[PDB]
């Protein structure tokens, strides 16, 4: 059941539970083709498109999935597989509100399987850097994404 | 600064039909959700309808559901209320405005 | 059908501070709300004082301030001032619509 509210409440929580992941991963540590919003998307004030932008919010949410499947394998298991599943419940409200049309892209399933034993093979440094700009890149998106449904 | 004009309200007959423009000015329109408000003689501030910066989400308050439809114009920065089947229920002033976002806050008009 | 619950009246003394609430029946008020506080002077259109719950509109006094207080949208004012009289109306966004409270009448005494 859809609601302008419920996905508020839904990408505020899963923005608090990313807060949560990074907390709980910096105190071990203290390129990536992440999704990443630009102007020619239609989600910031200056060109802003409300049919663009639902569609590059949806896109790159369905991208985010399989970085943070990736990050299920990464003793708080609940906490990171709340954070995928509760993603995917954002999806679902998104692509209800879109209902009006659907023209994405979709990401292709084997390539995703092949980037995620390429970031598995890495050492644990490099597996604590992935973490943190998996983190920081799906905030990122998500703030822009609040600011943008506010006016959709 | 940022301008907000309603016109043109005015006496019409019950079943009648009315439309309301609200000329916005001093912001970027086609960035902001719109919404209007109207306050009915002696009572409380009441929450009639809202569109979307492109038009493509139209809510509506369950009161006026049927009867009222939202309508946006750019580069006529320009709101229209439509509505019918009016009903003395629906005497008040109107207020248009803009939703708040983009370091920008809730800007209301003198009313209609 | 949600209903936003505000005081009827409430009153306080010059240089005092005030404390509006707004609530839901449905449960708690959230950031996901985005609670607005107006002001209304008699005869006069509503005035804009808090958005998004504890932002302040252009040229508002710092005195009003916005805030979720236990499961309510809050609205207090530190150092009334006889001019802070009138009724003050509460709106949240619940669902897809926006809801406005019943208004508050505060009275700066006495």
């Known amino acids: 059941l859809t609601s302008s509210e419920r996905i508020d409440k839904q990408i505020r929580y899963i923005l608090d539970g990313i807060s949560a992941l990074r907390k709980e991963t910096c105190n071990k540590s203290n390129n990536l083709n992440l999704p990443k919003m630009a102007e020619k998307d239609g989600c910031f004030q200056s060109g802003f498109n409300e049919e663009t932008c639902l569609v590059k919010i949806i896109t790159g949410l369905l991208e985010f999935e399989v970085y943070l499947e990736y990050l299920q394998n990464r003793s708080s298991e609940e906490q990171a597989r709340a954070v995928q599943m509760s993603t995917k419940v954002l999806i679902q409200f998104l692509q209800k509100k879109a209902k009006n049309l659907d023209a994405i892209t979709t990401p292709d399933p084997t390539t995703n399987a092949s980037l995620l034993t390429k970031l598995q093979a890495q050492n644990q440094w490099l597996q604590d850097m992935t973490t943190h700009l998996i983190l920081r890149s799906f905030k990122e998106f998500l703030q822009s994404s609040l600011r943008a449904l506010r006016q959709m | 600064e940022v301008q907000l004009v309603e016109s043109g309200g005015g006496l019409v007959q019950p079943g009648g039909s009315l439309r309301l423009s609200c000329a916005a000015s001093g912001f970027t329109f086609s960035s902001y959700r719109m919404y209007w408000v109207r306050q009915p003689p002696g009572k409380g501030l009441e929450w009639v309808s809202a569109i979307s910066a492109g038009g493509g989400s139209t809510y509506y308050g369950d009161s006026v559901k049927g009867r009222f439809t939202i309508s946006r114009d750019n580069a006529k920065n320009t709101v229209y209320l439509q509505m019918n089947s009016l009903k003395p229920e629906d005497t008040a002033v109107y207020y248009c405005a803009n939703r708040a976002g983009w370091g920008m806050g809730d800007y209301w008009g003198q009313g209609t | 059908q949600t209903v936003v619950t505000q005081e009827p009246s409430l009153s306080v003394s010059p240089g005092g501070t005030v404390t509006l609430t707004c609530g839901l029946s449905?449960?708690?008020?959230?950031?996901?709300?985005?609670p607005g506080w107006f002001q209304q002077t008699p005869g006069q259109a509503p005035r804009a004082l808090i958005y998004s719950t504890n932002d302040r509109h252009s040229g508002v006094p710092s005195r009003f301030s916005g805030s979720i207080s236990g499961n309510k949208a809050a609205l207090t004012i530190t150092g009334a001032q006889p001019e802070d009289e009138a009724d003050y109306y509460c709106a949240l966004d619940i669902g897809d619509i926006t809801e406005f409270g019943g208004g508050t009448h505060l009275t700066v005494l006495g």
């Open positions: 449905s449960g708690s008020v959230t950031a996901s709300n985005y």
